[PDB]
């Protein structure tokens, strides 16, 4: 049993809005060091937990968890576009095993994914089509949302399935740490906005995409001007969460509720559920130890950047 | 705290293919007696569990369980076409409660339902828009499928939520008994039928609907000629299942697996999961007793007709 | 959920060797009263546990338990000869359920049965082809033999399966109470005797059957002259066994071993295992009460005659 | 106490149908290395678990487990023929102990065996009459079939008995990995085929044997042409099963059912039950360590070749 | 299950030494009433627990418990002399069952009993040869002695055996209440009395018997003159013991030790162990209630007279 | 605390009937090596468990266990005769402690013992009066017999008492392995034989002793001619028993019953109970390890010779 884990924040505003050059150099160095460690590990399988940003999943059918037997990246915000290499038979076996373990898992054969899925693959693996990948979508924007306990159990089931494959497995978490970007909501929407939310938004014209990107960039700039326009960053909770993950106290997160998390840190903080899943997976491989802890509140981007790694000790 | 339950088989081939007049009169009398009992009960809320037949849910996103905040009937096979009356606030509260209870439940705001949802409402309530209804979708045709234990806990969570509303609740199960009609499969499909299965089946033209209905009718006639063209009916297992449901021994169904059920009775027998859910729900209201048991193997229709009712003992 | 049980000793020496006319009249009256009670009960299914006397099973393959999907009577010792009516689908379902329950059960599609199966059917039901029957063979002559605990678990599994059929079930036990008649053994056999024991004895010529019957009759007459030629009868143990069965203390028989039983009462006493199975079966139907207890040591026949009945107090 | 274990796939199509010379040399080298390790171990007793292919056991009496006190190999598919050296007293003691342990075990004194029993003895020991052997037949072709839990407990009981003999014991599992060759069935049989299935097929004339062998060879050639004529091989499940066996997680196989295994891998995959039994046996001797893992999907033969070994560490 | 119990003090000094006529009439009336109740009960079997007074058991072999398969009365102190009717087969079955239950029981085929056995049979049944009897000897004079817990277990085992005989059983306890008459001891013995104690006391000449009886009578007269020549009577402890027996609190006697009992009440008080056994036996038959309590300290005899009865509640 | 244990088979036919000289030399060498180890240990106390052969205990009183406060060897079959050195105070303390521990132990002050007691003392210690000895008689010829569990508890109680004496204790088991010599029985006896069995056989005349010895010698010679005149030897069960004793798995013998042991190995095999007791005793002293295992089936003597030793690892 050999396993590697790396959790990293993703940000669509790379190049569009930039911090000081020293911060960018430090972030790039951290990412390069993580990539070097991953390349040294030389994985054979990748399991990628990621959220969506109203690009592939809508309110026509909104599942808490989804597994992508076939996935294609649409290439938004400058990210790569194209079809992902997914082993069909292995994915179907994983779906059967997780369904049998007691997890109600949705299955998709044509899953459109966005920068949340594509960016970690480019940054850490070098491309989309390097290593076979199992994509797992976790809902984080549309209420009701899954809890910490169900996410932990999903991660444990996936890790228990993957521990019997006699392969070197790399686990990835793509969610952010703490931020509150302007995200469309169903309750306060208008007619056109409701129509876009209830599906029919997969084939968005380029003009609407440009308008959405411009709105996100402008909101980010206003956040740089002042953090009270959105929910302000919470470094204390981010550090507590990372420390809890490293100390092997993941189960202590079962006491935190969804509304409590939203009040403390913000509505988008739920992306961190991906991280939780990843860590649960590695707990199935035996004893492990962490490394490469990095955190920094970057106001130029909306989120607070974080990165962590773990390795199974054999 | 008052509760009623009625589980009844649904058959699209009512009038298209007919058995002898005597059995038709007997079935109509049983249905009329059940309708009279329901009208005497005078429910205030309806919770309906029903499957789909590749008309509203496809392989783009296939969840095990779904809740319909908004549902519209498509009027296939001569069934009623119209929009179902769903209380939005109650549906959202139910979704939140079931998610918190530990069930991974999908949510849809524009859910297209087939004759499986429409026919019981016409037959027992008298129309689509008589009583407010909470539509619950359970997958029964696309593998992997949910098990008996997860369906039982879904029913228990829904019943636990509804027991606190201070209303008279009627529970319905629309699934049929053991049968095996021709159903398209993803593995053995061709290009066109793979394309229809993955999606684009919501906007199905009328010519394809006519061809599908004609093929179903022809297969039913061949089944009447000989039962070996499909999986033959299994009265023994149907009677065992009904007896287990009546005796309050629902948990004994947790030992039966999906492949075992498919081998014993047929692939479509999984529709009976709806029945299980319904019974679990009534178990949350306290003591109950059953009545109106009826079963008969009708070869003219593909399925074996069944009907059962239960009432809480206040 | 209704059940009846009747256990009765069988004796091939009816008419060949006879006791006084008074005791014969008493036995016939007891049998007639039991038949009247059974006819009043009006059963729908019969589960018959009976042993074999080296007539259908041999040392080519000797199982501890066997289920007969197809059975045919050979008409030995003046008993009826013919084919038993066995429901094939019900028998196969029973075999599947008992196998799944954790009992290693053998199945046979062509089972030859001696007077042990035929005589109770004639005496209690009126004929071989009156009611559908499930024949269950329990080994009692060829070591190693099954214990009391495994026989009890087999009976419990069969009763648990049959309690969900929504029928009226009659359970029968056909073994004797206490005796040790001359039975061929493998250890002390000669060449021809060994050849007959290891199979090849199914199609026995009539001359060998006549010689066997004459030897049994002569041994019975010598036993009438003196009981020390064989193992003497043990009324105390027979009464203890019957009392234990009536008081619902069947599990107390798990402490008794096979060699202890053989030493106390005789090698053939193991036939009573059938009785145990029958009683275990009725324990699956709920509360029951016993009746019709009769015991008498008849030295003219080899065994000690006994009879008992039980009814579910619905 | 010291013990050795070796599980190896068997294939009647050795020489009749051949793959490339390189893979044949590789398989021969693996077999030779296993034989060398066994010869170095120098065992004193062999316990051989094996299936049958409708040559020794039929539907006259079909047990789930059988122990051969006397066994003779018939010599089919070019395998060796003749009497097997079985210690009678040791076999009878083993039967008594296993019966007392709570396993319903059949006993045979003239057991006709086939290439499934003979081929491993020739390949790994050098001949049929080298070391005393206890043959254990496990049913794998005729439904209903024993489960994984019952097979595990049978192996545990046999190992517990053999751990007190003060001998060096070698355990063998002759079953193959996932495959599905054409095998006659009872449900779809004709009159002559049913007559052959319900016994009377022990003394098959050479013409019928030639026809059966030719049909098997032709089916193998068609499978080489295309794998969809039968159930295609499943390397994923084979590797999962081997990894589960090596990691000491045999109990996890109790959750898998018979119909689930048949659907996932094929009807003949049940032969792997023999492997399970073998491993359970070694768990009775204390701590053990595995070695010699080899797997390769050979399409030229029907099965997927596998081999594994284990040793008690002292 | 029908059971009766009667415990009564025995005294060899009836007629030899007499109290006032009124108390003699009262004792005779109590005994007559108990005899009338026993005759009304009409028992079928008698189990008699009685002690010995160095007349049948000596230091050659001294067991704590003994069962008499054959017993003969010697007729001392004017008691009846003769052979007791003991069912041999029933006694042997009882011995086997009690030994299997976990009690280390001795057996004797020629047991010489004394007035302790004979007197209750004459007084309560009318003679020695009226009803079949199972004689059980409990040691009470030779140290080391059995405790209360082992005596209770012996009584429970005997009652559990006798509850399956389908007979009406009468239990008797012949031990007396608190007293301490002159009893020879091994430690303080001289040569001749050491020789008599170890053995040769069975064929005791009549002159030694006369001397022993005269010594007992003289000691009784001196005790009448003053109670300090022996251990004085303890009415308080006798009443506590009887109250504990009636209230079903027999287990509370497990805390009392042998030396504590000897110090509190006297060395001969250990005879009451018989009473304990009797009561334990009736606890095996179900619910029971006591009656006929009588106690009186008679100084003219050495012991303190007591009598108690119990009846099962059918 | 320090403890030694040695169990050795005894045989009265030493010199009267002899095997080959090599076998005799090997047996003498094994015995001499055991004697040397015992002499090196230098014990201070000996506890000797032994059976009787109808020489000291008869059916007048037959206890399951007996402790000899005073013992005398009668000198049969050429063994030594005379008084044994027994510490009276220590023996009485042991009797009190064992009685208090919950074992129903008989006590004798004049115990006549035979070659079963005398021969191990001569062979292993050098004489009868070398070391103080506690003799414990265990019944093994007269039914009913004590079981394995009660014998184990007796051994544990004795070891627990002796572990507090601050001495070096040697434990001996004088019983023999599987065999069945001609032994008089009560059931099949005649008038004179019954009279001798029910006592009166202590002071046997020399002529009857000569006749008994001659009959035993003749039966041994016939057994040498053929082993079927008695029960044939069972090396398999003997080796299993020795292996179970060495592996510390003594409690596994609680499942074996008396009749099962008699059927498997023979009536006299019950002598091995002594061995069990011895081993139980050493388990009270802490951790121990075994040595000096020797077994050989000697047909010239009736029994199968065995020898084993163990020491406490301080
Ligand atoms: O694609 C979109 O709609 C924007 C999503 C988005 C916005 C701000 C910060 C983020 O980290 C982020 O993922
Ligand atoms: O609507 C469809 O697509 C056909 C569904 C369907 C087909 C056959 C038998 C049925 O009972 C059934 O519901
Ligand atoms: O049927 C046979 O083959 C003879 C068996 C048999 C022999 C003796 C006494 C019996 O009661 C009995 O059934
Ligand atoms: O011996 C027979 O009857 C054929 C059995 C058989 C057939 C195909 C592939 C196999 O691996 C196999 O064992
Ligand atoms: O029977 C004998 O040998 C004398 C026994 C004895 C002595 C004194 C008081 C008694 O109550 C008693 O029973
Ligand atoms: O001592 C006696 O009276 C004979 C006992 C005896 C007889 C045969 C074989 C033995 O091993 C044995 O101990
Ligand atoms: Fe994000
Ligand atoms: Fe349907
Ligand atoms: Fe019989
Ligand atoms: Fe095979
Ligand atoms: Fe007394
Ligand atoms: Fe002996």
């Amino acid at each position: 049993m050999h396993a590697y884990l790396h959790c990293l924040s993703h940000s669509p505003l790379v190049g569009y809005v930039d911090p000081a050059q020293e911060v960018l150099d430090e972030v790039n160095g951290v990412i390069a060091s993580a990539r070097e460690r991953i390349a040294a590990f030389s994985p054979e399988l990748v399991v990628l937990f990621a959220p969506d940003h109203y690009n592939g999943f809508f309110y026509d059918v909104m599942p808490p968890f989804c597994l992508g037997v076939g996935a294609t990246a649409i290439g938004d915000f400058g990210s790569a576009a194209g079809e992902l290499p997914v082993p069909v038979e292995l994915a179907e076996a994983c779906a059967h095993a997780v369904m049998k373990s007691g997890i109600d898992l949705a299955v998709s054969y044509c899953m459109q994914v966005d920068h949340g899925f594509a960016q970690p693959l480019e940054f850490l693996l070098g491309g989309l089509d390097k290593v076979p990948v199992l994509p797992v979508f976790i809902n984080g924007v549309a209420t009701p949302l899954p809890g910490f306990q169900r996410t932990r159990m999903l991660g444990e089931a996936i890790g228990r399935f993957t521990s019997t494959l006699n392969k070197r497995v790399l686990f990835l978490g793509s969610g952010g740490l703490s931020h509150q970007p302007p995200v469309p909501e169903l309750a306060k929407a208008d007619a056109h906005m409701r129509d876009r939310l209830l599906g029919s938004g997969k084939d968005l014209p380029a003009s609407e995409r440009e308008l959405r990107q411009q709105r996100v960039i402008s909101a980010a700039e206003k956040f740089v001007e002042d953090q009270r326009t959105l929910h302000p960053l919470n470094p204390i909770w981010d550090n507590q969460f990372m420390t809890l993950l490293e100390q092997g106290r993941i189960q202590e997160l079962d006491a935190v509720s969804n509304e409590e998390l939203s009040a403390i840190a913000g509505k988008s903080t739920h992306e961190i559920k991906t991280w939780v899943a990843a860590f649960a997976a590695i707990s199935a491989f035996g004893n492990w130890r962490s490394e490469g802890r990095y955190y920094r509140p970057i106001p130029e981007w909306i989120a607070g950047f974080g990165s962590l790694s773990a390795r199974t000790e054999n």
Side-chain angles (χ1 to χ4, degrees), chain A:
Chain A
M1 298 206 225
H2 310 276
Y4 209 71
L5 173 146
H6 183 71
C7 296
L8 176 78
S9 294
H10 73 259
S11 182
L13 312 166
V14 176
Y16 300 96
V17 170
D18 277 333
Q21 186 63 252
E22 177 266 322
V23 192
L24 191 58
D25 286 8
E26 183 178 1
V27 159
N28 286 358
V30 169
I31 292 183
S33 188
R35 171 164 180 174
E36 294 294 328
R37 295 200 303 270
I38 292 173
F41 172 75
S42 199
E44 316 174 66
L45 181 66
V46 180
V47 178
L48 169 57
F49 305 96
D52 188 66
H53 306 88
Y54 280 119
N55 294 108
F57 286 97
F58 298 100
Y59 270 117
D60 61 357
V61 173
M62 179 56 76
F65 313 124
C66 200
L67 167 67
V69 182
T72 289
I74 68 178
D76 69 313
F77 265 116
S79 80
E83 183 178 1
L84 273 69
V86 184
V88 175
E89 294 293 328
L90 195 57
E92 293 179 353
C94 187
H96 175 85
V98 172
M99 185 64 72
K100 185 177 180 180
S101 295
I103 310 292
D104 314 318
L105 182 74
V107 167
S108 183
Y109 280 79
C110 46
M111 207 159 82
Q112 329 285 318
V113 301
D114 58 11
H115 72 273
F117 279 86
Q119 184 177 2
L121 288 184
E122 311 161 7
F123 282 9
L124 294 165
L125 275 297
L128 268 53
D129 47 305
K130 302 278 154 293
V131 179
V133 62
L134 291 176
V136 184
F137 153 82
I138 305 185
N139 179 29
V141 289
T143 62
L145 297 159
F148 275 120
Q149 177 174 344
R150 291 310 284 179
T151 311
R152 182 175 50 84
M153 296 186 72
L154 171 85
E156 289 185 353
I158 287 187
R160 189 167 45 244
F161 167 75
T162 46
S163 72
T164 74
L165 290 179
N166 220 33
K167 293 181 181 179
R168 285 187 310 269
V169 189
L170 168 76
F171 296 104
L172 298 180
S174 191
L177 265 188
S178 171
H179 47 95
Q180 187 72 86
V183 166
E185 289 190 359
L186 196 61
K188 307 170 181 176
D190 50 279
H192 187 87
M193 183 177 176
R194 279 198 62 100
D195 204 80
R196 298 292 183 184
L197 281 189
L198 264 74
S200 75
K202 307 183 178 178
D203 307 348
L204 272 180
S207 62
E208 303 204 9
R209 301 186 175 184
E210 288 172 2
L211 297 177
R212 190 181 188 185
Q213 296 188 356
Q214 287 296 329
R215 284 187 292 178
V216 177
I217 290 182
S218 306
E221 295 166 10
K222 305 154 198 176
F223 188 73
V224 181
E225 297 170 356
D226 173 29
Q227 289 202 1
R228 286 188 285 180
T229 65
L230 320 163
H231 201 274
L233 259 60
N234 193 352
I236 300 179
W237 199 88
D238 302 359
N239 282 298
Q240 291 187 247
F241 176 67
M242 293 183 77
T243 304
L244 281 165
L245 284 182
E246 294 182 27
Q247 281 171 19
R249 292 158 65 191
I250 180 170
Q251 184 178 2
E252 290 211 5
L253 279 160
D254 301 358
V256 192
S257 82
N258 289 345
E259 281 92 357
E260 172 180 352
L261 176 64
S262 293
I264 283 185
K267 293 187 286 185
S268 298
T269 311
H270 288 279
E271 293 189 1
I272 71 176
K273 297 275 180 43
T274 62
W275 289 41
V276 166
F279 266 87
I282 207 163
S283 298
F285 274 69
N287 283 272
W288 54 270
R289 65 179 177 88
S290 57
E291 51 187 338
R293 170 177 192 153
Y294 175 78
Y295 175 77
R296 187 177 179 89
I298 302 176
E300 282 71 30
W301 306 333
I302 316 188
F305 201 85
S307 161
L308 190 49
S309 307
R311 183 177 292 171
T312 294
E313 68 208 359
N314 288 127

